[PDB]
Amino acid sequence: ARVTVQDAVEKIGNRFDLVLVAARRARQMQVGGKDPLVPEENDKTTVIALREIEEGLINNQILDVRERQEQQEQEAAEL
Amino acid sequence: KSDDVNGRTKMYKNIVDGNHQMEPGMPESFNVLLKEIRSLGINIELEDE
Amino acid sequence: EEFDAIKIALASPDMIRSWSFGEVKKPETINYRTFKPERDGLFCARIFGPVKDYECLCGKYKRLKHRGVICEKCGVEVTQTKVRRERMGHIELASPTAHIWFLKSLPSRIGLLLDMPLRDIERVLYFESYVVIEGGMTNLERQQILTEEQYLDALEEFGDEFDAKMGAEAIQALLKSMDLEQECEQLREELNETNSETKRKKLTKRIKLLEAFVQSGNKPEWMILTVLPVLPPDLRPLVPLDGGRFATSDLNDLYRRVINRNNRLKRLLDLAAPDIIVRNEKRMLQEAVDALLDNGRRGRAITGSNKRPLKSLADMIKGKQGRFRQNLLGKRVDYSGRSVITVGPYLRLHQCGLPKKMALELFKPFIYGKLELRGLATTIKAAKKMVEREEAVVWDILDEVIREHPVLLNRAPTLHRLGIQAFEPVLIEGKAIQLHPLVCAAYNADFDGDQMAVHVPLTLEAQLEARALMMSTNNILSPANGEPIIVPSQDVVLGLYYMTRDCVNAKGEGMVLTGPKEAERLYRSGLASLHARVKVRITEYEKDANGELVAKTSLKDTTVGRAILWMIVPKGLPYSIVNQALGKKAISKMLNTCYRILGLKPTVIFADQIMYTGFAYAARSGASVGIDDMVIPEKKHEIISEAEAEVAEIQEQFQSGLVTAGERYNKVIDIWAAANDRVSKAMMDNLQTETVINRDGQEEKQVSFNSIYMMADSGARGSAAQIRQLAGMRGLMAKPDGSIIETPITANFREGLNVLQYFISTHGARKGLADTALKTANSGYLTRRLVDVAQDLVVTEDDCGTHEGIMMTPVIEGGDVKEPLRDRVLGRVTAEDVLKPGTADILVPRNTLLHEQWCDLLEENSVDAVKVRSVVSCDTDFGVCAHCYGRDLARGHIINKGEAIGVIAAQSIGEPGTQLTAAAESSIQVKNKGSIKLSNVKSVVNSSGKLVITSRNTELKLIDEFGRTKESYKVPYGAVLAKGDGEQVAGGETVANWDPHTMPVITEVSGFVRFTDMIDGQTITRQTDELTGLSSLVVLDSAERTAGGKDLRPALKIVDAQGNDVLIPGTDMPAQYFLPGKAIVQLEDGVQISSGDTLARIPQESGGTKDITGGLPRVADLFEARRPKEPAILAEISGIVSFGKETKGKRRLVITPVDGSDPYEEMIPKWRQLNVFEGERVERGDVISDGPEAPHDILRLRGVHAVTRYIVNEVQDVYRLQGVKINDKHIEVIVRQMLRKATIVNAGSSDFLEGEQVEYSRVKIANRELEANGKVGATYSRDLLGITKASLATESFISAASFQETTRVLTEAAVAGKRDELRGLKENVIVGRLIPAGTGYAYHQDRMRRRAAG
Amino acid sequence: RSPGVFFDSDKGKTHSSGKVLYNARIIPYRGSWLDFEFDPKDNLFVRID
Amino acid sequence: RVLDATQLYLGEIGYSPLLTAEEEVYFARRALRGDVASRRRMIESNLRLVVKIARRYGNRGLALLDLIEEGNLGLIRAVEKFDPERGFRFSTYATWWIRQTIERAIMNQTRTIRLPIHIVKELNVYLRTARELSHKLDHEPSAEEIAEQLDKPVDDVSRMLRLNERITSVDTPLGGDSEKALLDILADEKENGPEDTTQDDDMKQSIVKWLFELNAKQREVLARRFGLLGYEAATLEDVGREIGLTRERVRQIQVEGLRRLREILQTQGLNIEALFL
DNA sequence: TCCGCGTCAGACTCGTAGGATTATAGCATACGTGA
DNA sequence: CACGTATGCTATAATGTGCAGTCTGACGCGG
Ligand SMILES: Nc1nc2c(ncn2[C@@H]2O[C@H](COP(=O)(O)OP(=O)(O)OP(=O)(O)O)[C@@H](O)[C@H]2O)c(=O)[nH]1
Ligand SMILES: [Mg+2]
């Protein structure tokens, strides 16, 4: 994850999409203050996002799922 | 990093706020290019979306 | 703010007035006293807006309290000062003026559109002569020039009913009155009568101009300027220097010229001045306008007070200094540093030493932000002062921020993507950057004063781009060839070589060790040398059928050194890899093996370990450079005195007047070239195996431990040619000309050169050095052209679903297999089903990546040739599929969709050229036994009894027991074969023999020699000797030839005893060999000859150093698709050959195929000799004449695969000569971009019609809609384009103009009214947007679907 | 380049013919240049500056 | 074909005949009486005189062609105001108008910053005097040396020589090579860096935070005056238009808002820290 | 159609240092805004 | 009025101008 990104690349596949997915997740922890799955072990949001992808916890599809889950529950609360 | 005048200040503020968000716009050199081309008497206009 | 597309069209006078917010009518800039803008001046604030934010000039309205207020008093609107760079103005011209760009920029546009020569228009413009606009009396026709005196004649006689005028007025009125519609149809009607080739080109040109003019909505009047736009003040600033001085743009001096003359013209018109003065002022106005638009175009550029040409508007767009190249495709960039670089051997591969003070300043805002989170800084001003004071706590914060933050290191020049790599920074006290040794290779970075640049990726996206895509650990393999670029050099190799390499017994020969750890213990304890032969017991780990590793313990015989290096070796690799004495070549294979078995992480750690141990043992070794290390040959003086008596023999043979100066030159050079080889060989046998003093039993031989030799043999440093001038003889040096001097070098560096040897060294040296500084421009220019043409190409699709590809073969050039089939088809998507030789069972699948596994199987099955999916044969429109490309060579797996392949290709081809900036082939010796197999050969037996070859491109194969090609050679013309076709030869036999410094002309028939068209003085010369008098005849070419004998072809005609001609067996051709220029002839007229005798000897001067100064122009000429000077003739269609008629020797060819029965004729020059002999079943593209092939003809007759493979092989010939590995697929990318366009011959169901040239992608998409709808189908022909023209042919005019030729591109685009919808990378980089590739492909396709759905 | 006279020749100006055209150049320290030159048809020409 | 603007014009002037005194008097009598032909033939005949006088006033500001046109305009004034009855020749009279008009035009167009004729002519006499001073003082002249010769204030000379500074081209390259010029080094002092722009954002936002930390009637008159929240930047007396309608109570409440905010900047850690910038 | 003038480009970042020059007659009356 | 900017006249005769320094192979375009 920190030194070598190969196993993280092998989870998603497309290097370019790995960057987009880990950037979107890192933005969540950076701004939302969304809680990390892996112990940070004093690492930056970027590294945490890649570790999460290596272990297979974060995913473009999984991010989109939790997006609609929380957005739809807020729509439910509004109405 | 370069021309985008709005972008650089907004980016600076984002960096001090921790959030490394990219808030880009248009490089000021391009605006100039167009004006220089029109000063040459060639109409170069932007068709918007 | 965000737009979709960009349009260029002609500026209407009325349109120019739309932009203007006021008319400038004064040259005044500012007031001398109050430096404030003058009224209606060039800097007028009343027009271009306020000098200060929300402040009028006189200061009546201040601050946002007065928002949109227009000061009644001064007449200035109170707004942002930003507007002064935005608002334009204008000038009302009293006389109209020609827009120089649509006049002088060729094609003339204004001349082409009026069908009026440029000279004619100008004579009208400068008021030399009248032009007729409409003579109602057909007595005088349109556009007919009348001189001053011609106008006086018709003036009284016809007058009134003819209108002829002068100057810009005349041309504008002529343009205004011309009806584009009517003249369009008129010219189309004329096109039908008798359309000759060049007449039809010019007519189609004007047709397309008229059609484009009506589609553009441009009007011809607008070519003439009545209104002149004024650039905003801040874009031509007048600013005060500190010293009270002022500095201004040159545009302001040019504007002043224009305004003064224009206003003077208004005055002269108010004053009713006489016409000659009016005229001079109108000429002056046009001169100043032309100077303002494009200064150094029309004549003498107007200079200023600096005695230099005033920078014109055009100059700011045009060239390197122009807006595109300098400020828009490349920029100065924030968060950037630079410093000296130095070694960081302690660093791991993913790290770089970053100076503390450098990093403190680069990450300034991140430190301020962290400081406010810790509450250490109250505000930003306090954070600033805390960092200025460099407080103790600030260092601990800086340490916190830079952790896990990647930084980009860059070295100039950036030739390939690896010229930029990301590292995790390590803060160091001290001002120099520390670089990792193993990546010094990529950067070409040597610490002899090299500096590097540091860049901070700011955004989370940029950080992840750096850590994932650009990290050094992630980018090991060259994208050019599938080879690891990260490879130990220098000290590292020397250390590992030292460890692995063995010595006789030494300390502790034949000991027995439990583990490599006991070996390390023994060495460092001092009871074993690293070179001691020892029976140790090491346990290697071999991979099984699955992912499980099978370990195996065994006692091998290795050195102590090798056992210790095994500890660095990861578990999984074999022990036999390290068990040999290791060099740079073996260590790279080590890294490659590690990468393919273990993967990335293990290779990265392994590479670091190797670096550490390599340096470590290099320093332990105490290796050095003595004067005793440079051993010279004990037999130098003998070899030299011998070679010197030999050269004296040929000098004496010259003084006798028999041997020519050129023959002696060649033979002296050959004597010394051989002397050089022999002395070098002597030194190297004396040095290599000089350690013949061993022990144990008696006297034993082993490799020498000479420090200098070790360095060369390991490949750490030095070579075999470097040791030549260190102990042997310097050798021959070649001049700045390229030519080699007669007197070479005999002494070396150890012995020491004199004043003469040293002075002679200088020439070649300085030629070399000047080549580096001057040629890199041309190499780099080629890189630039390549990159520009391959820009747009990106992986678009996964699978195009095409069955297409190109069948590849093994390159067997010479005796060693230069490129194997395995290496040429490695990681290339195979097409169809390619099995083993015996066709009865499938071996490899259809759509499958070629893995090292399947490649190994190919060799065991002996596959001859295989269809492989190529970029050229991809069906994907607007890019290529991952399948047609194959493996990303840099990744070691299948390419990811979205990757920008073209740029990678152009960089990969260009870099080696840019960075890189013994021909005694007497006789072929076959080495393995075989049957001799000639092809494309027509030989004839001679008087001697020897098979002499009379065909130019003869090839010689070497067929093994089963029947397959092992070795291959080029046997040249007039070569003598030892055994003919089909005969067996033994190993180490001279199968072919010839003279290299000569190209003989050999006969096919026996009889006597006749002289035809060989008159002394006109075509040939004559020179005799003494006593007897042997005279030689030397044929003059058009250079040394008079106008008398120019159409006379000199030839040696064959005749019999009677005097009649001798027919060539099996042809109606009287025997006549045409001699070319500078052909030396020894036999005079009336001499008997047999078949196989040499008539004349054509000289073969080409003693260059080759290197990279003479190969690249060949490559550039290939990529620019230049037809060669004497191109070979090829059969157009398959069928039966028939020879026909002759026009006094000029060969006609009445060729009659089978199905296409209608005959086809072709004229051929008289002296050009055909290799084939008529009456034959000819395939399309059978070579008929000897010479080079034009890529266009190849494409036109034998299609895409043929021309693609011609370019790939001919280019690859050059790079292979220099030992440069580039995969064919890169050249194939560029080739594909060359084949972008196609010319439609015959109408479709759209508005293509005859002769339009459109992208093949768009016409194939049209053909998909035609297939579904039927209608009239479109017939077309694919066209080849050179790189430069192909880049200009892209629909994107932003891309075209940014490349080159900018003035012309924008006139073409402006007149066509072209609209660029921005799809390419170049275009997006210019507007400063997201790349449509790599990371950006996700966002850019999301935009494309937003665009598709509204 | 020293003032005086100088005899030169482009070795194959027109690469088509490849004919050597010899030329003379009188270089003064101050004044106009005086050039003499051959053409392909071996006609002697004079050009000033 | 000769396309030179100059050569073309000089060709055309050549093909008009030189006049004698009697011819000049005849034409000029009718010219004052308003004869379109007379004025034109006198003009066209004497263009050659203009050009001859235009070749002496070169290397000063404009080009020969430019001077030739202004010269022509001077000759036109001369033809309008010529006296045929007076025995004096025309060429003598025209010379005065041509030299006059040329000199005057090279005094308004020659300099990028328009110096008034009067300053320019003042400066010119200072210059010609300096030349005489340097001719006998071997060394060039000081400000006081010129002032001493004219018996005038040294400040007059200083100010007159302070307006002689010439304009440097922004585009002129430095070091001789055509690379980076004054434009590539000349920094915009009007456009501040993100550091300064972001400092202003932080500064402006800072106050707002502590602006809503004071009293409700302390931030309803203090901001509605400076124009921070309100629409228009008012003065102490103008705040009465809102609701305050007071002059002293507005000034007491303004400064009371400022004093409680001064202690908000002293506690957060600014005051003297944020004083320097 | 060939000889010939014209156009077109000719590597990427570093750097050192400012800039200098000339000259426009002399005086009387006329036109435009602040004090 | 003053201060800045402009317009004006004076009258022996005088009447066609005066800086360029060549680089190189290739690719197009009127005679
Ligand atoms: N871009 C550019 N690079 C240069 C220039 N001069 C030298 N270099 C670089 O500086 C280095 C000097 O030569 P070396 O690098 O020592 O050559 P080398 O590849 O180490 O080969 P060996 O000397 O045989 O070991 C080269 O790698 C060049 O690329 C130059 O004018 N421009
Ligand atoms: Mg170096």
Ligand SMILES: [Zn+2]
């Ligand atoms: Zn105002």
Ligand SMILES: [Zn+2]
């Ligand atoms: Zn494909």
